[PDB]
From TrEMBL, chain A:
This is Peptidase. The lineage of its organism: Bacteria, Pseudomonadati, Pseudomonadota, Gammaproteobacteria, Enterobacterales. One of its GO terms (cellular component) is proteasome core complex. GO terms for biological process: proteolysis involved in protein catabolic process. Coiled coil: none annotated. SUPFAM superfamilies: N-terminal nucleophile aminohydrolases (Ntn hydrolases) (SSF56235).
TrEMBL record, chain C:
SUPFAM superfamilies: N-terminal nucleophile aminohydrolases (Ntn hydrolases) (SSF56235). Transmembrane segments: none annotated. GO terms for cellular component: proteasome core complex. One of its GO terms (biological process) is proteolysis involved in protein catabolic process. It comes from Yersinia bercovieri. This is Peptidase.
Length: 237, 226, 225
C-alpha cells in the first residue's frame, strides 16, 4: 500500500499501488484510487491506505450517500474544505462503529477541484482532522512512503509541469516496488489538469505496461551510469 | 472446514464442506424472499460461535420490530448486521470465526463480503472477486489459475469443485458431503442448491478427469534440464 | 376484551373472549407430560401481540430463558415481567397478562402481570384474576366461586360471567376460547372454542336467564316503610 498525490500550479497528479494486506495469508489486489465526478462541475479523488475494512466502508458510505440529495454528500458540498470535513466525519463514524485501538486506523488523500475554486489537496488522519497541501508542501504520501520520498524531494516543486510530476510519481513507485514487497503492481494513476473537470486521464498500469517498463529501465540504467562516473573516493588521511 | 464464494459478472458461486473437528454440519445457509432478495451465509471457525450467529440471524428474521436479514435495505446493511451480531456473541463473556456473506437484494447488483472475527468486513471487487475461509490454501492455486471476474458461472463452480477436490485430498479435516450453490444474476432463486455426496456422479467424473488430466501433462513434460 | 382465570385445589379454568377494538387472547405453551402454561391478554393489542410473539419466538432458542425451560411458574412470571419491561424500554399502551398452569414438580400456580412488569400471585384467599372489561362479570364469581369449587362449576361460573359481559358490553364478543386444566394432567384436551352456535353455551345462558327472572318474580313484595 503506497499512494501519492501532488498539487501543482497547472493541476494534480495521483498514484496508487494495489497490493493490499487483507489477511495474513491473504495478500490481494484492491483499488486504492476512487473517483467522484460530475462532468463540467466537479472532480474529487480519494486514495486509501491502512485498514482495508475501514477505507472500503468509508468509500462505500460516501458513494451511497451521493445518491441521496436530502443528505450532505460529496456531490453537494460547496468546497473541497467541506468535502474534507465530510471525509473526517465518515472516518470517525466507521472507526467508532467497528471498534465497538489503532487496529482500525486509516489515512486518506483527497484532491481535486470543485467549480468556482482552484485545486485543493488534503491529507485526512485517523482522528478525522486534516491538513492541506500548500506551495511549500505540494504533495502528500500515505502507506509505505519513505522509499519513494527522496526522489520527490529532489525534483518536485509547485511549478513542475504535470507530465514531469507523473514521471516523478512513477519513479517513486519504482523505488518503492524494488525495496518493499508490501507495495505491488498493478498501479492506478491519474492526471487532472486545472479547470478541466475531466477524469479522461485515468490509467491502470499493469506489469505489461510498455511505458512503465521503459521508464524503469531508463531510470535504472541512468542511475548506475551516474554512479559509475562519480569522481573517485577521496577521504583525508 | 473450507468455504469459498465467488462474485462474477453473471452470478455467484458457493461451495462448502461439512466436516468439523472433534460429524456433519451445514456450512452454507440461505435466506430467500422470492423475487426480492437472496442472501447466502457461509461459516468457519469455532462451531459453537458460528452456530449461535446463524441461529440468531434466522430467528430474528421472525421479529419485525428488529433489524434482520429480511428487512435490511442493501447487502451492505446486511454485512453490518452480520458484524453487529458477531460482536454481540463474542462480547457476552479460541472463539474466532469467519463468515462469507453473499447474494443480491432487489435494487443492487451482486455483493459479497468477508466478515472477520472482530465484526468488521471487506467486500469483493473485480480485482479480488472471491473469498476463502477455513482450510483454504490447498485449494487456492487452481482458483488463481483459472478464475477471473468474467469467468462464466458453470466454470466458476467447476473451479470451486476442483478446489474442493485438491483440498479433500490434502487435509482430512475437510470432508464430504458438500453443499454448493449457483446464483444467476437477478434470479432471486435458490433452486440451484445441491448436496454433493461421495456417490455424486458428476463430482466423481470431474475429480477423475482432472486427476487423470494432470498426470498426463506431468508425463508430457520436457525432460529435466538443470 | 375480557379474560378470566381460576386457580382451585383440583385444577385451573380459563376463559377469554376474542372481540377487539378476531385475535387469540389465550395462548398455550405445552410440553406433554412436563408443563402446561396459559397466557391471557388484555389491553393494548400492539403491546400484547409483541410480548406474546417474542415469547413464542424465544421458545425456539434453548440457549435463552424461555417458557419451555423455566424451572418454576415463578420464573415464568419473572420472565414475562422482563419481556414487559423490555418492550416498554424499547418504545397509552397498557397491557395486562394472566399466567396460569403447572410445571412438573410444582403445584397449580396463577399470576397477574401488570403493565409495569411486576406481578401478583393467586392465593386461596384470592383464587381468580380478571383482566379487561371485568366489572360486569365479577358479581357472579364472588357469589359462587371459592378455592374448593370443582372445575366444572368454576367453568360454569366463568361462562355465566362471560354471558353478563357479552350482554352488557359490545367491545366483548364471541367466539370464546376456554380451557379446563385438571391437576397434574399436563393436558390441552379440554381446550374448546365457543361460537354463537355452541349448544351447551346457548343452554346455560337461557337456563340462567330464566332462573333469575323466576327468582325475581317470586321475591317478597316491596316493603320500604
Ligand atoms: Cl517489482
Amino acid at each position: 500500500t503506497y499512494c501519492v498525490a501532488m498539487r501543482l500550479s497547472s493541476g494534480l497528479a495521483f498514484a496508487s499501488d494495489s497490493r493490499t494486506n487483507a489477511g495474513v495469508d491473504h495478500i490481494s489486489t484492491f483499488r486504492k484510487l476512487h473517483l467522484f465526478q460530475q462532468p463540467g462541475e466537479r472532480t474529487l479523488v480519494v486514495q486509501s491506505a491502512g485498514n482495508l475494512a475501514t477505507t472500503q466502508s468509508i468509500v462505500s458510505l460516501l458513494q451511497r450517500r451521493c445518491l441521496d440529495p436530502e443528505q450532505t454528500n460529496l456531490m453537494n458540498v460547496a468546497s473541497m474544505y467541506e468535502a474534507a470535513t465530510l471525509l473526517g466525519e465518515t472516518v470517525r463514524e466507521v472507526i467508532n462503529r467497528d471498534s465497538g485501538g489503532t487496529d482500525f486506523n486509516c489515512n486518506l488523500l483527497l484532491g481535486g477541484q470543485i467549480k468556482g475554486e482552484g485545486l485543493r489537496l488534503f491529507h485526512i488522519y485517523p482522528q478525522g482532522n486534516f491538513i492541506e497541501a500548500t506551495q511549500d508542501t505540494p504533495y502528500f504520501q500515505i502507506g509505505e512512503s519513505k522509499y519513494g520520498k527522496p526522489i520527490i524531494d529532489r525534483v518536485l516543486s509547485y511549478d513542475t509541469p504535470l507530465d514531469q510530476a507523473m514521471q516523478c510519481a512513477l519513479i517513486s513507485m519504482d523505488s518503492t516496488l524494488r525495496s518493499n514487497l508490501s507495495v505491488g503492481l498493478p498501479l492506478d494513476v491519474m492526471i487532472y489538469p486545472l479547470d478541466s473537470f475531466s477524469t479522461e486521464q485515468q490509467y491502470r498500469i499493469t506489469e505489461d505496461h510498455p511505458y512503465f517498463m521503459m521508464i524503469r529501465k531508463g531510470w535504472g540504467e541512468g542511475l548506475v551510469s551516474i554512479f559509475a562516473q562519480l569522481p573517485g573516493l577521496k577521504l583525508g588521511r
